[PDB]
Amino acid sequence: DIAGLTPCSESKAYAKLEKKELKTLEKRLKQYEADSAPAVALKATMERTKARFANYAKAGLLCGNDGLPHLIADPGLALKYGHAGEVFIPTFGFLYVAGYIGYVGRQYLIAVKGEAKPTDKEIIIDVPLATKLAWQGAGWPLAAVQELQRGTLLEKEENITVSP
Amino acid sequence: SWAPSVFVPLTGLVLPAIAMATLFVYIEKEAP
Amino acid sequence: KLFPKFSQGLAQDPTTRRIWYGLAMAHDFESHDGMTEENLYQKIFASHFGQLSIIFLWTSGNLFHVAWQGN
Amino acid sequence: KKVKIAVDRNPVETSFEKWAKPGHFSRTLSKGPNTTTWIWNLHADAHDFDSHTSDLEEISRKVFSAHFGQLGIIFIWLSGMYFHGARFSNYEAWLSDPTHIKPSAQVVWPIVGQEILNGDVGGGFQGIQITSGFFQLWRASGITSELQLYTTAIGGLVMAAAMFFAGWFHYHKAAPKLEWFQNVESMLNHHLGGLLGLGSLAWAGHQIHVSLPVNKLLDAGVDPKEIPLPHDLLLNRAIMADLYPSFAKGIAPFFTLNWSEYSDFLTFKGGLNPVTGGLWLSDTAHHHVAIAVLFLVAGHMYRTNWGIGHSMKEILEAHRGPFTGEGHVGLYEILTTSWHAQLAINLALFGSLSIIVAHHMYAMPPYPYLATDYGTQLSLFTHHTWIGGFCIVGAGAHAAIFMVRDYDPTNNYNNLLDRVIRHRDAIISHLNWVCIFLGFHSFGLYIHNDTMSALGRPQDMFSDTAIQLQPVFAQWIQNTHFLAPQLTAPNALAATSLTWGGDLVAVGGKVAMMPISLGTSDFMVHHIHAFTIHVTVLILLKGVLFARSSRLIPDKANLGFRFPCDGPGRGGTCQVSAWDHVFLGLFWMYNSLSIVIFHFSWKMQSDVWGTVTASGVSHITGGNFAQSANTINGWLRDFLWAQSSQVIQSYGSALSAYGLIFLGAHFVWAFSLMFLFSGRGYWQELIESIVWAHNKLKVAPAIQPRALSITQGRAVGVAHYLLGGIATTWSFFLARIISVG
Amino acid sequence: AHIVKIYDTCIGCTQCVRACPLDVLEMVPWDGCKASQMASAPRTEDCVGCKRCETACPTDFLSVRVYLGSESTRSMGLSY
Amino acid sequence: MKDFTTYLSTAPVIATIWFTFTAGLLIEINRYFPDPLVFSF
Amino acid sequence: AWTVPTLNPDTPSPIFGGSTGGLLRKAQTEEFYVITWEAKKEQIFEMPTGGAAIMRQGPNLLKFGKKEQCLALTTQLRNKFKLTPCFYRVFPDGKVQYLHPADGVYPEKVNAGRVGANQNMRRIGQNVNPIKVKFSGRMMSPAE
Amino acid sequence: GWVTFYWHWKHLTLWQGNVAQFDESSTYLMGWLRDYLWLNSSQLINGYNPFGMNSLSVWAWTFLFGHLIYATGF
Numbered sequence A: 001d002i003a004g005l006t007p008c009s010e011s012k013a014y015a016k017l018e019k020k021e022l023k024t025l026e027k028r029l030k031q032y033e034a035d036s037a038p039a040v041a042l043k044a045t046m047e048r049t050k051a052r053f054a055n056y057a058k059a060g061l062l063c064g065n066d067g068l069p070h071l072i073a074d075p076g077l078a079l080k081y082g083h084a085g086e087v088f089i090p091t092f093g094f095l096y097v098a099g100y101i102g103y104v105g106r107q108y109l110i111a112v113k114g115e116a117k118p119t120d121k122e123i124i125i126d127v128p129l130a131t132k133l134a135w136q137g138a139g140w141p142l143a144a145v146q147e148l149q150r151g152t153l154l155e156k157e158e159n160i161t162v163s164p
Numbered sequence B: 001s002w003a004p005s006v007f008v009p010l011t012g013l014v015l016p017a018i019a020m021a022t023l024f025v026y027i028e029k030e031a032p
Numbered sequence C: 001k002l003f004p005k006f007s008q009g010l011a012q013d014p015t016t017r018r019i020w021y022g023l024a025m026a027h028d029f030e031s032h033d034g035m036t037e038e039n040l041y042q043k044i045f046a047s048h049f050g051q052l053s054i055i056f057l058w059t060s061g062n063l064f065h066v067a068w069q070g071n
Numbered sequence D: 001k002k003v004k005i006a007v008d009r010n011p012v013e014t015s016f017e018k019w020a021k022p023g024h025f026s027r028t029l030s031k032g033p034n035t036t037t038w039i040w041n042l043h044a045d046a047h048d049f050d051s052h053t054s055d056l057e058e059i060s061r062k063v064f065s066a067h068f069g070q071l072g073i074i075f076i077w078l079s080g081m082y083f084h085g086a087r088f089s090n091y092e093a094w095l096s097d098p099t100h101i102k103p104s105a106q107v108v109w110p111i112v113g114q115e116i117l118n119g120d121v122g123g124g125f126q127g128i129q130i131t132s133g134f135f136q137l138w139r140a141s142g143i144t145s146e147l148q149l150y151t152t153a154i155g156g157l158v159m160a161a162a163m164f165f166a167g168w169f170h171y172h173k174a175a176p177k178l179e180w181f182q183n184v185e186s187m188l189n190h191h192l193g194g195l196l197g198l199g200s201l202a203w204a205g206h207q208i209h210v211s212l213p214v215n216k217l218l219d220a221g222v223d224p225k226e227i228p229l230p231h232d233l234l235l236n237r238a239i240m241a242d243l244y245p246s247f248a249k250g251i252a253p254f255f256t257l258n259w260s261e262y263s264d265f266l267t268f269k270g271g272l273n274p275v276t277g278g279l280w281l282s283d284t285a286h287h288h289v290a291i292a293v294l295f296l297v298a299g300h301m302y303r304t305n306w307g308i309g310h311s312m313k314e315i316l317e318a319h320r321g322p323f324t325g326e327g328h329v330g331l332y333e334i335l336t337t338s339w340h341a342q343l344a345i346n347l348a349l350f351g352s353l354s355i356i357v358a359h360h361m362y363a364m365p366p367y368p369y370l371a372t373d374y375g376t377q378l379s380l381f382t383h384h385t386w387i388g389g390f391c392i393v394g395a396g397a398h399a400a401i402f403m404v405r406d407y408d409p410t411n412n413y414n415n416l417l418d419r420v421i422r423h424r425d426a427i428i429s430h431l432n433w434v435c436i437f438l439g440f441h442s443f444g445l446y447i448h449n450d451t452m453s454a455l456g457r458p459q460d461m462f463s464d465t466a467i468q469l470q471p472v473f474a475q476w477i478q479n480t481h482f483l484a485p486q487l488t489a490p491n492a493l494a495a496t497s498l499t500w501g502g503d504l505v506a507v508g509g510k511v512a513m514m515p516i517s518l519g520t521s522d523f524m525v526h527h528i529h530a531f532t533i534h535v536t537v538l539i540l541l542k543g544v545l546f547a548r549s550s551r552l553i554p555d556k557a558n559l560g561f562r563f564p565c566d567g568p569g570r571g572g573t574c575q576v577s578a579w580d581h582v583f584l585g586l587f588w589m590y591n592s593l594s595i596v597i598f599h600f601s602w603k604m605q606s607d608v609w610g611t612v613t614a615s616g617v618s619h620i621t622g623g624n625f626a627q628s629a630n631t632i633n634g635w636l637r638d639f640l641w642a643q644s645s646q647v648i649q650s651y652g653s654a655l656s657a658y659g660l661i662f663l664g665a666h667f668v669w670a671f672s673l674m675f676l677f678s679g680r681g682y683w684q685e686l687i688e689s690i691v692w693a694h695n696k697l698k699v700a701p702a703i704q705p706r707a708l709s710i711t712q713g714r715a716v717g718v719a720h721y722l723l724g725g726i727a728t729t730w731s732f733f734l735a736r737i738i739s740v741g
Numbered sequence E: 001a002h003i004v005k006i007y008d009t010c011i012g013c014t015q016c017v018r019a020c021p022l023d024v025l026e027m028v029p030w031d032g033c034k035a036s037q038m039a040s041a042p043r044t045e046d047c048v049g050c051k052r053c054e055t056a057c058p059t060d061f062l063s064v065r066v067y068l069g070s071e072s073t074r075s076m077g078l079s080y
Numbered sequence F: 001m002k003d004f005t006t007y008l009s010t011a012p013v014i015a016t017i018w019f020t021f022t023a024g025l026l027i028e029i030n031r032y033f034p035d036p037l038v039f040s041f
Numbered sequence G: 001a002w003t004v005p006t007l008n009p010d011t012p013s014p015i016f017g018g019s020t021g022g023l024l025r026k027a028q029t030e031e032f033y034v035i036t037w038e039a040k041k042e043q044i045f046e047m048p049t050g051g052a053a054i055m056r057q058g059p060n061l062l063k064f065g066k067k068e069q070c071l072a073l074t075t076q077l078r079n080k081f082k083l084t085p086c087f088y089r090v091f092p093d094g095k096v097q098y099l100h101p102a103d104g105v106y107p108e109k110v111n112a113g114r115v116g117a118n119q120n121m122r123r124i125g126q127n128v129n130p131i132k133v134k135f136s137g138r139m140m141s142p143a144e
Numbered sequence H: 001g002w003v004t005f006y007w008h009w010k011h012l013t014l015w016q017g018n019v020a021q022f023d024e025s026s027t028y029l030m031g032w033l034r035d036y037l038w039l040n041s042s043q044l045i046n047g048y049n050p051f052g053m054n055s056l057s058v059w060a061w062t063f064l065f066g067h068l069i070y071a072t073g074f
Ligand code: CLA
Pocket: D063, D064, D067, D068, D071, D180, D181, D183, D184, D186, D187, D190, D191, D193, D194, D195
């Protein structure tokens, strides 16, 4: 109960929706022989379904009046009430990989600018240079702040403009 | 009570027929 | 030949876009032929009187049709 | 020998060295990128072989091996459909009950919840219900086992490898010379004789010896593992004489010309098999026999190496009259020295074939348990009309490519083509008139019915209970084709289809085919079709005839086939090329064929399809085509709104992917309107403003970002428009008809 | 009529005149480039404004420059 | 096969190998770790 | 030597069966444009109005409604056929106007004596702002 | 159009009473398509039919009339 909400292990619409999905799977299962190949896949779907409900109720997700889990996207209401794995932990688990790709592509461009003709190594990617920059880009925030402290991250007004 | 049976054909069939005529004649006038 | 009285270049247009651009750059007063800044401001002032009179005529029509054909 | 094999040994060395160099085919693209327009010109000019080189021999070699590439891809595709029919299907179950088991041949992997798409198709099986009609083909061929499907899938892989090896051989190792390709008389004799004639003779052999006895034992009612295998039907004449008692006389009635004794298994029944709702396979057997004899006669027409036969240049140069100048002189030399002029005619007649196939496979359903599978019927009609309409627009495109590139005024003086160019203004003006006439007198009938139904005046509408517009001519043709077994085809036991009149064939409680009444709404929609087909002809033929010049631009042929414009001058000259005319004809082919497939999907659901109880048969939509298609609001309510009520609530079911694509193709369609409405000088400046941001953070690419070209952005817009509209209608049709059909 | 002006960035490579579909442009003697020649627009009454001249100008920020003005029966490119 | 390896290093071939790699990594993850809505432990 | 040739309609037309792309009422009321060229041999050329005509040996005369049609015909006669054509301008009151090679020399070659109209002795980036040309009587570009 | 779709549908579900019918359906675009556009355009398109007409027929006509101008714009 952060903003009119309720834990999903407490709310009854969540359990009613679990029983609704298991009821649809059960009346779907009632047509087949108990050991046939469709019935095995239907019971495996039931097992994945029940494991999904158990692990959404276990992590302390907040349900609403609809019986559906919600995501508190504010630190200080996620850190204080234990919901940092909703948004606040994957908002850095994403940005590590985002700045990773943005650093690997940056360094692949800068390490191919100073050649004979760079464009041929942009349609035909130099794979050993690409995999070297793929592995050694693991510490990208480190190298990014060390590049920002120089001023070698930005370029000055050598850039191309029109008519200011 | 006879106003919607008279003003509506004038405004839609008669006064636009003036406007389809007099505002069209003004278009192709030869400039002196 | 006559209808864009404001545009002598549109008036010499033998095609049918003379009509369409006489209707469309009629209120672009700054691009009119012989336009000065004083006549610009004077036409804008008269235009604002025309817009105010249309707004009041429209509201009076709303009032009259509600008073006459309404409940 | 004038007609002889003539090749060149080892013309092109087989090496991966030119795979390393993209753009090797083009003189301009071989220097590499400096600009992102390069990589779109790489894929756009990839197969335009006529612009790579000027040597017609090299062009013909490239287009002859590219056809082996397409054939290898089609054999991979067919072999995959046989393999997915073998290993992932309920076809074994479907053969025992082909009325309560849905044909399924695609199973998904249970990962992200997509295993809900493995619906309960029946037969102890879960998968996606297919609608491509392969199971009805396989019953009509006499398959009866997934072992035969697996082995013809292996044969399809072998034949795909044969096609890929053949293209490699006839391009790299022993490639034919130019005057090999210019033997069109030999190509027509071999294709009418060997492809069409011997192929239908061979399919006649398979139908006589394999599919007639197997399907007769299926229709009598025999388990498919109890049926004799077809090699036991070849070797044992006693089983074939048990099934058809004139196999005991052997091939003696064929050579004594006592062919009437073969009337046990070559028939002229007509109508439908009432056991299964398809055509009689004895009737299709005699069909392919007669087709085989006809095309083997037709393939001995043209002169190749002996003095007998016709030569097509002498056929063309003789047919000339007083009205048409020099007549057909010069048409042989432009249909032998231009591949685009061939591809125009072939795409035209082949796309007309697809539509004739689509109209001839609903009314005369050729497969067992095809007609009561309503989803297969709807998807086959829709598929083949779309393939036909695309091929007709490609005909209109490649005719104009011939006009721009390969047309020569020296070779064409006062022949037919020159005299058509010299009255193109009369042609396009009269077609403009007839398009405007058809537009008013077809769509204004719908606007009239909208207005009268909205003004509380239903008596003044155009309907059957109002001002009637009866299709007297099509109704007269229906009467004559229903009375054709009386005196104009006296050896027909029934009419050639059930649409002309009579009773209904009912299979499994569902109507296979019943007679189709043609009323006022049928009149109005056939004239909607005539209108939209004439407008598509107007646009495509205006692009062909004005491909080289007009009164607007007299030197349009110097600008090319595919150019955006000739600037803002002389009023504006946007979209003046022939490419832009086939661009605008693609929208009208979409417009026409969407109404064609809507008219099919609502005429069939209203007046043909539905369950029968032998108690006054109740159709699917209750019989509201003639009663409610008078109005645009009737097509809105009772067709789009009413029948979208199964694609919109398909979530949580096996049809839910059709619920997703119906949204997604509503996306892509509207996404196309970003490309169709906007223009390049916006997006190039937006790319400048973000190239600045990539310059500021040292991440400007060396291949410089450009906006798409003008005729590239038009191509992207029309491609996304067609994809998003056709896939919307795809998902709508299939989610409607799998559920309620 | 349209306004066709040229500028002194002309290198005299006479490509606008060959690109012109209406003979608006012609080459005039001049002494500001190596080719000793510069274009001219004496016949802007016949110009339609189709801008083929400034698809053919090689100089960055084009030396020929068409400004779409009033439209006569020749500027609209009419056979009627 | 040096030219074959330069062909394998072109833009669409690297795109269709790397997208199958990053597809069939996430697909094996969602097989062995079903339904990750929230970062658990 | 060269001084402004004149025209007679006595010179023949190339053999052409007539198209629907020919002249209109603008030819009879406003103006129409005629083209002359001397051909060396009889050969087939594409009309700018659609269709193929065969030119005959000696002088030819062909009439059009646009200057672009006549210059397109000159463009394909000078390139494909290496001929030297010239077209004029005819008004309905009989007044004829020499239009193509004014000085005889084709305009892509310097004749040393033609005058440079519509030239700006300044760079195109050195145009004034549109605020400086505002209220110039008519609407006006900064290139003037 | 987005702000007025959102205003109209949250107020239709408010005026009908079932705000949960909005809260469960407005989270996904199919719920916007079938619970707002498909659902509330029943009595609109039934303004006229072959059975008769009612007072919404002038809005049934204009709804098609607006569909006709829009496409003509294309
Ligand atoms: C009776 C002989 C015969 C037969 C059956 C064919 C059949 C075919 N020709 Mg063809 N052709 C022939 C003689 C023949 N040709 C002659 C004599 C010439 C020279 C004048 C040509 C010149 C020619 C050209 C230029 C082209 C064709 C193409 C085609 C294909 C059309 C596509 C189609 O319908 O796929 C139907 C598919 C099948 C029938 C699958 C079965 C495949 C069989 C086994 C191969 C075809 C039979 C083959 C000719 C026999 C030779 C065997 C080989 C070992 C020598 C088709 C396979 C086009 C094509 O697609 O090329 C690949 C094409 O571009 N032909």
